[PDB]
Amino acid sequence: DEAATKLDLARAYIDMGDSEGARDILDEVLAEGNDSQQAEARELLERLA
Amino acid sequence: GADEAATKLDLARAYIDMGDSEGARDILDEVLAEGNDSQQAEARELLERL
Amino acid sequence: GADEAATKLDLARAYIDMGDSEGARDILDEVLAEGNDSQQAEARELLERL
Residue A2 in 3-state DSSP? helix
Q: Residues B4, B11: contact at Cβ < 8 Å?
A: no
Question: Is the CB of A34 inside 8 Å of chain C's CB atoms?
Answer: no
Instruction: Kindly state whether A5 is in contact with chain B, defined as any CB-CB distance less than 8 angstroms.
Output: yes
Class (C level, CATH) for A1-49 = mainly alpha
The residues, ordered by sequence, that sit 6+ positions from C18 with a Cβ below 8 Å of its Cβ are: A5, B7
Please spell the DSSP secondary structure of C12-29, one letter per residue: HHHHHHTT-HHHHHHHHH
Tell me if A41 sits within 8 A of A28, measured CB to CB. Answer: no
Resolution of this deposited model, Å: 2.0
Contacts of A9 in chain B (CB under 8 A): 7, 10-11, 14
Q: Which fold has domain C1-50?
A: Methane Monooxygenase Hydroxylase; Chain G, domain 1 (1.20.58)
Separation between Cα atoms, residue A31 and residue A47, nearest integer Å: 19
CA pair distance C21, C44, nearest whole angstrom: 14
**CA distance linking residue B19 with residue B42, whole number of Å:** 18
Task: Calculate helix-pair angle for B2-18, C2-17, nearest 10 degrees.
Answer: 170
Residue B7 Cα, gap to closest chain A Cα (Å): 7
What is the distance between the terminal CA atoms of chain C, rounded to a whole angstrom? 25
C4·B18 Cβ contact <8 A: yes
Q: Indicate the Cα dihedral angle A43, A48, B3, B7, nearest 10°.
A: -120
Pick from B4, B6, B13: CB nearest A28: B6
Nearest-10 crossing angle of helices B21-34, B37-49:
160
Q: Where are the domains of chain B?
A: 1-50
